[PDB]
Write an enzyme that holds these catalytic residues in place. Structure first.
Site, PDB file in Angstrom:
ATOM      1  N   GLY A 139     -40.070  34.195  14.656  1.00 32.96           N
ATOM      2  CA  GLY A 139     -40.986  33.552  13.732  1.00 32.96           C
ATOM      3  C   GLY A 139     -41.882  34.582  13.063  1.00 32.96           C
ATOM      4  N   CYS A 140     -42.194  35.680  13.750  1.00 28.23           N
ATOM      5  CA  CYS A 140     -43.059  36.691  13.150  1.00 28.23           C
ATOM      6  C   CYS A 140     -42.453  37.259  11.881  1.00 28.23           C
ATOM      7  CB  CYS A 140     -43.348  37.838  14.112  1.00 28.23           C
ATOM      8  SG  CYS A 140     -41.967  38.911  14.485  1.00 28.23           S
TER       9      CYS A 140
ATOM     10  N   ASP B 202     -43.878  37.199   8.116  1.00 29.61           N
ATOM     11  CA  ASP B 202     -44.003  38.399   7.313  1.00 29.61           C
ATOM     12  C   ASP B 202     -43.401  38.260   5.918  1.00 29.61           C
ATOM     13  OD1 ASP B 202     -45.116  41.026   7.314  1.00 29.61           O
ATOM     14  OD2 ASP B 202     -43.070  41.735   6.989  1.00 29.61           O
TER      15      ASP B 202
ATOM     16  N   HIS C  41     -32.915  39.524  19.897  1.00 30.50           N
ATOM     17  CA  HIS C  41     -33.892  38.463  20.042  1.00 30.50           C
ATOM     18  C   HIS C  41     -33.274  37.054  20.034  1.00 30.50           C
ATOM     19  CE1 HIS C  41     -37.148  35.748  18.767  1.00 30.50           C
ATOM     20  NE2 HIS C  41     -38.006  36.652  19.196  1.00 30.50           N
TER      21      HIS C  41
ATOM     22  N   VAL D 294     -32.086  33.875  18.023  1.00 28.38           N
ATOM     23  CA  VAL D 294     -32.987  33.027  17.238  1.00 28.38           C
ATOM     24  C   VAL D 294     -33.820  33.958  16.379  1.00 28.38           C
ATOM     25  CG1 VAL D 294     -34.746  32.953  19.124  1.00 28.38           C
ATOM     26  CG2 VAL D 294     -34.811  31.279  17.273  1.00 28.38           C
TER      27      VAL D 294
END
Lengths: 171, 171
Positions: A79-80, A84, A70, A76
């Protein structure tokens, strides 16, 4: 539960195994879903609302699994996953208070990503500000969260909501 | 790009390398962050706002990596990954329209998890309803999303926001 103010990587690994808070308390995920290396401060007061606070950290290195996929050629942190980590912490806190049941993220209000975590960063800090706790026969936690990379605030999330469920089939 | 209404697992994997829309276009994450197996339908109109629609699917089996670590003895698909799949699809649609730059999720308005995906389920469906696109010097996509497991709605997200950055130094 004997509340400690801080937890180490080994304490968090035990948590995922169900050993930290015991068989009836919530568990954190195990690698590779565990998104924290340590919990440096936990308090039942304090925080922006004076109703609780938790600060945790994740050490960054170029070899973390998520950078390789990713994205290919453009690493990077997703963001998920940072989001979490914040749900993970709210659930960990509810168990720290002595709440029983398995954790389940229920939702979040507004989430804003204003920067990124690159493989050259050194550390990610998570700060959780509790607004409301319902540790009745219905354990739920409501909180705001912040994510900083080497001290720079990059993600904010309002109204992170997590519940503990004695019987998870009812979900 | 040559627009198609459906893509296979193979196309999605090619997309992780920038081989579907070209080097200037955005990429989808590669396994294990790729959260769908195929895009079953993509249209420029349609959807709840008649401004674009995307339907994609993820096949479920007990062996998917995330069931083992989330949680030990309580396998459940992380809601954060279902949410990410929705951000992945908005970025993919932007690329499909011929957008140039790297994708970055900018945020979400409100998220609600009212159900869960267990290892016994068979298929997860993602439905994205576009409400606004900015394909100028500034490329952003705003959409509402829905996740269904075996035909039953479990997660909803309002105002998923994703942007394509030509220069990721602007983050």
């Amino acid at each position: 539960v004997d509340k400690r103010e801080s937890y180490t990587k080994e304490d968090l690994l035990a948590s995922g195994r169900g050993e930290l808070f015991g068989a009836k308390g919530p568990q954190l995920p195990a690698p590779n879903m565990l998104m924290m290396d340590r919990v440096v401060k936990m308090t039942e007061t304090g925080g922006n609302f004076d109703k609780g606070y938790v600060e945790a950290e994740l050490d960054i290195n170029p070899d973390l699994w998520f950078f390789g996929c990713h994205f290919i050629g453009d690493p990077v942190m997703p963001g998920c996953l940072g989001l979490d980590a914040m749900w993970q912490l709210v659930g960990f806190y509810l168990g720290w208070l002595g709440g029983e049941g398995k954790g389940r993220a229920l939702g979040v209000g507004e989430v804003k990503f204003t920067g990124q975590v690159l493989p050259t960063a050194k550390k990610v800090t998570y700060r959780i500000h509790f607004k409301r706790i319902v540790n009745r026969r219905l354990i739920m936690g409501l909180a705001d969260g912040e994510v900083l990379v080497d001290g720079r605030l990059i993600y904010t999330a309002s109204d992170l909501k997590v519940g503990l469920f004695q019987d998870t089939s009812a979900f």
